[PDB]
Design a protein around this nucleic acid. Structure first.
Lengths: 109, 49, 205, 117, 101
RNA sequence: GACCGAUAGUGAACCAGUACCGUGAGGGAAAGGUGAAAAGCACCCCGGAAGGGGAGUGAAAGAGAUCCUGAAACCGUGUGCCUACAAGUAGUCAGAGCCCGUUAACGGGUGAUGGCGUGCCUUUUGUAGAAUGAACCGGCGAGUUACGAUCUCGUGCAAGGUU
RNA sequence: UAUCCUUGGGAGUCAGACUGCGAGUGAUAAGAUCCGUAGUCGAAAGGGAAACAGCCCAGACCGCCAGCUAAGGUCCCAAAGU
RNA sequence: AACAGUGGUAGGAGAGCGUUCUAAGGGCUGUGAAGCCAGACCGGAAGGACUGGUGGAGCGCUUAGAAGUGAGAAUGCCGGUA
């Protein structure tokens, strides 16, 4: 069992999830390929955290790169940056620049 | 007596009537003042005579 | 009204007759209750105030036009339901004291004293002389008398000398013959009374 | 003194919230509506606690009617015949238990038929 | 098996079984007997308002119970009318022995 | 101090009459809490960093700069039961099947299928109403106090009572 | 049969509707309006009249896997008589 | 024990439940209080216990007292999130 978290990386959680959900529960050495080939906003952030997760083996409790598979992973909402966008007739509409917490938990099998 | 068993002269004590709190004690929404009368409004009384 | 007499070192002499009109009276439960309640309420100083709507440093302007807006029709900013505050029917500086009839107060003090007498917790200590301000002298006196719990001591003339010794140890009070009340009596569960003060209070009542 | 809105409100609301488990979505989550349904639940519980009597009675009548009809006898004639054959304090529910022990039910139906004429 | 009128509603009982029934006056350890038996089953003795002589049905009773709570809540809409009343129905457990016919 | 304890209490516990708004008179906010002591994270690994995983400090690292507690709305991840010929103020009362085993008791979860059934509040003769109010959660938010009057009740005295 | 009267403390009510019966206005029209009389609703659930406040029967202190009935009904929906 | 009764709006009357502080008596608490989270427990109700988890210093019971004492609605105010 090994774990990693991104802790408020600037990306919308829905957009994160839409690309995140497909790698769930499939062998990491090929999931990384799937995700670095699929073009999406959050793909680079997600492979960075996944690579940190698998790389938690060197100055860490030992695992092997083969026979390694994502165990379970998900997306959590983080603190949001409020912003007021100007809009016609002095309405002053509001917008949410969301943030998200990414998290990977990889295990052996 | 001692203070730790103080008991008043029974019949010489009554709790206040907290009008306008819930329905279980009556006098709820209306606070026991009817519906929308002049008497039902704050300072809505009239000259006594 | 024939309670025994005690000396400084616990030696007991011939018992003393007490005025039945003051100490043999049947205590009045209700009158004692109201007498307790009386100064128990009057003691509080009751200083409290909270800023009513008028005096909240602000308000003034109508926050928005009466109609033609999607918000509730409102008044000034400092109003009760607003976050800005302004309480409604809050506390106010007021006194929690009144007065009772002379007969009632006399009956109350007589009743409590007689209650103590019948409960046999009164201890008459003639001539509570003391040569020094030191506390442990009077602590030894109380130990000799077997006075364990709270107590009250009244001695009229030795108040000047004995008050300093008594006041710290450990929650007992020294009062003068004129300072008797209902709480100061009841709360202390043990009355030390010097004979001069016996007849002085006897004359007063 | 000042009394602040302490734990009393939270306990009061959470009682109904926990009481209203199993409801569809927001009705098991939002006090504003969860309170409404439990009140409705109380009314329905009372009225259905009174309905179950008559519904079980109806079911018993249906079973007795079927059992009687399968022995050349209508339900109404069966009940009449029983009453005249004697005060059959025996009644609907246990008559159905006799039906599912049918031989006893027939052993009553024959007596009722015989005494009916 | 047999049919026993008991508390204003008859019940089917059989030798050795256990039954819940409305509160009797008996203590929580003593035996009790029912009297108004009908349709003694098996050999199926039966009469209208049956005087089944000596067929009082003995039973041992050990419990004094109080049913699970029914939160009777009543309200009438739009009228500020509420009534909530807890209720536990008392009862007694039984076990039947020596059916008499 | 039978006064408040961070929507309270001064507008202002905190660089507040500040930021901000207004040409100007003027209006006018939000924002308290690491730990006992910074002992506030040596060193290593992923990473450009941020952020992580280890290691170490400490009684607690889930205690890491809104940092004591951390409720609800809201958002997710696994899952036991159910669901693609059925329309349902969404429940309740019957109820098979499947799963679990309790503050031990005529137990808990889910429930194929049947009966019944038009939310809450105000205002109305009348509301399921196509009349009004609520997007949801949390907090706050309305018959008191003073001085007199009157009546009931309770007291001490009583042809007197009372300061 | 046991509700009546006197004094005293505290109210709300002043928008009422429908259905019989006797009248007005109306065109013996109106779920119209205004009266008298009785009922229900108002402020009353339950069963019936398909759904229904005022029509019929009938009053809910709670529990029961009891029984007898009122209006209405018994071929299936849907309990009871082809 | 007997007998009778126990729908209810505006209203009147009585019983109580809980909250914050204050006095008297008792004592609970780092051998883990308050608060929060979860339970299949108790009472006629408001409600109150018991057992776990969190949390890391304060707090119930008893009798009486005084109240800024109980929210679901006010196109309520503030904050947060759909």
């Amino acid at each position: 069992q090994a774990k990693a978290v991104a802790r408020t990386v600037r990306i919308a959680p829905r957009k994160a999830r839409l690309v995140m959900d497909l790698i769930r529960g499939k062998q990491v050495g090929e999931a990384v390929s799937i995700l670095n080939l699929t073009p999406r906003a959050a793909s680079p952030i997600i492979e960075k955290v996944l690579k940190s997760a698998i790389a938690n083996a060197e100055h860490n409790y030992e695992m092997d790169a083969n026979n390694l598979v994502i165990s379970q992973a998900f997306v959590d909402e983080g603190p949001t940056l409020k912003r007021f966008r100007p809009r016609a007739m002095g309405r002053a509409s509001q917008i949410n620049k969301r943030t998200s917490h990414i998290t990977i938990v990889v295990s052996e099998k | 007596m001692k203070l730790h068993e103080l008991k008043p002269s029974e019949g010489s004590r009554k709790t206040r009537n907290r009008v306008g709190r819930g329905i279980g004690s009556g006098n709820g929404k209306t606070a026991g003042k009817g519906h929308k009368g002049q008497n039902a409004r704050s300072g809505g009384g009239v000259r006594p005579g | 009204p024939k309670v025994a007499l005690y000396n400084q070192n616990g030696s007991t002499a011939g018992d003393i007759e007490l005025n039945a009109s003051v100490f043999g009276i049947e205590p009045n439960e209700s009158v004692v209750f109201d007498a307790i309640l009386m100064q128990r309420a009057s003691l509080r100083q009751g200083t409290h105030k909270v800023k009513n709507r008028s005096e909240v440093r602000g308000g003034g302007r109508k926050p928005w036009r009466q109609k033609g807006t999607g918000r509730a029709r409102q008044g000034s900013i400092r109003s009760p339901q607003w976050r800005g505050g302004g309480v409604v029917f809050g506390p106010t500086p007021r006194s929690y004291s009144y007065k009772l009839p002379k007969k009632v107060r006399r009956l109350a003090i007589k009743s409590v004293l007689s209650s103590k007498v019948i409960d046999n917790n009164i201890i008459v200590l003639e001539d509570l002389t003391l040569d020094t301000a030191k506390t442990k002298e009077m602590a030894a006196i109380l130990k000799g008398l077997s006075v364990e719990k709270k107590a009250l001591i009244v001695t009229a003339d030795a108040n000047e000398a004995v008050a300093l010794s008594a006041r710290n140890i450990p929650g007992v009070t020294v009062v003068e013959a004129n300072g008797i009340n209902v709480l100061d009596v009841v709360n202390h569960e043990k009355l030390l009374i010097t004979k001069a003060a016996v007849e002085k209070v006897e004359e007063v009542l | 003194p000042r009394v602040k809105g302490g734990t009393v409100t939270r306990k009061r609301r959470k009682k109904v919230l926990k009481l209203a488990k199993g409801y569809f979505g927001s009705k098991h989550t939002l006090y504003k509506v969860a309170n409404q349904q439990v009140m409705k639940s109380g009314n329905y519980a009372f009225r259905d606690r009174r309905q179950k009597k008559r519904d079980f009675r109806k079911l018993w009548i249906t079973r007795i009617n079927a059992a009687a009809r399968m022995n050349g006898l209508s339900y109404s004639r069966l009940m009449h015949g029983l009453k005249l054959s004697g005060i059959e304090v025996n009644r609907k529910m246990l008559a159905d238990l006799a039906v599912n022990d049918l031989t006893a039910f027939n052993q009553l139906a024959d007596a009722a038929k015989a005494q009916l004429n | 098996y047999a049919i026993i009128k008991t508390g204003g509603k008859q019940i089917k009982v059989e030798e050795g079984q256990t039954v819940y029934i409305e509160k009797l006056a008996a203590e929580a350890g003593e035996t009790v007997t029912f009297e108004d038996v009908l349709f003694v089953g098996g050999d199926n003795v039966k009469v209208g308002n049956p005087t089944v002589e000596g067929a009082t049905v003995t039973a041992k009773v050990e419990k004094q119970g109080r049913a699970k709570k029914i939160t009777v809540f009543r309200y009438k809409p739009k009228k500020n009318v509420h009534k909530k009343q807890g209720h536990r129905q008392p009862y007694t457990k039984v076990t039947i022995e020596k059916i008499n016919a």
